């Protein structure tokens, strides 16, 4: 994350930290005691599929505080349409070997209805993104979960506002822009899958999942976020699905 502030511990209970062989892979959200959404593009170069961990309860990766929970990741499901190496349909559902144990510091994040979110959460200017960015970077707080506050943009104002003669990449119905065009704050490498959490009438819900952009906090540029709303139907389907064998599974879309 860029331009962020550390997230008061337990003020981001649905953030997940995804490892591949003890390594930092990405971030992701916890919707219920067993499922986890995250960006599809993290599992593009995964070879050792048996070694996918998912740490929840984390905050500061430099010290310990009985809150961290590890769980294996049995499945990583993503759009049949998801085409490796592209920007469209950057989402993935994750089935965890054993359910996590909700606690004051581990809490799922309300996923809404394809209606509620399109009529409402859609029209809310400010929402939160969160994550650890690049855990190698040497900065003092480099090891702390950080949250940002970013306003959302109607994809058009985003195509417009974008110093877009600048190789403007397509901006599909399956995405939306968000942030500040001036290059002060934005999500960044290692944040993918993180939740772009929205608050409304008292509860947080999930609208985006950190996807890509054109340079972290680049002037004239915004950060893209996968439009959760669109996948909803597909996510609730796959949660009632008969658990399948292989780790990766390309469910058909829609």
């Amino acid at each position: 994350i860029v331009g962020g502030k550390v997230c008061p511990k337990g003020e981001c209970p649905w953030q997940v930290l995804l490892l591949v062989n003890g390594a930092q892979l990405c971030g992701g959200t916890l919707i219920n005691t067993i499922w986890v959404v995250s960006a599809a593009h993290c599992f593009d170069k995964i070879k050792n599929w048996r070694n996918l961990i998912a740490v929840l309860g984390e905050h500061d990766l430099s010290e310990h505080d009985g809150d961290e929970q590890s769980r294996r990741v049995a499945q990583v499901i993503i759009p049949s349409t998801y085409v490796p190496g592209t920007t469209n349909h950057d989402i993935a559902l994750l089935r965890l070997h054993q359910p996590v144990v909700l606690t004051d510091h581990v809490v799922p994040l309300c996923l809404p209805e394809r209606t509620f979110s399109e009529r409402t959460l859609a029209f809310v200017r400010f929402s939160l993104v969160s994550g650890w960015g690049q855990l190698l970077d040497r900065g003092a707080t480099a090891l702390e979960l950080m949250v940002l506050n970013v306003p959302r943009l109607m994809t058009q104002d985003c195509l417009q506002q974008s110093r877009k003669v600048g190789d403007s990449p397509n901006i599909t119905e399956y995405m939306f822009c968000a942030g500040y065009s001036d290059g002060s704050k934005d999500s960044c490498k290692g944040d993918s899958g993180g939740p772009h959490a929205t608050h409304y009438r008292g509860t947080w819900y999930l609208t985006g999942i950190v996807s890509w952009g054109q340079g972290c906090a680049t002037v004239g540029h915004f950060g893209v976020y996968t439009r959760v709303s669109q996948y909803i139907e597909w996510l609730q389907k796959l949660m009632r699905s008969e658990p399948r064998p292989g780790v990766l599974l390309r469910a058909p879309f829609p």
Partner: peptide, 17 residues
């Protein structure tokens, strides 16, 4: 591998080797 890094909770080592 996160374990490789000295400033990390050593808990992150159970997931390496």
């Amino acid at each position: 591998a996160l374990c490789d890094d000295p400033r990390v909770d050593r808990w992150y080592c159970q997931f390496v080797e």
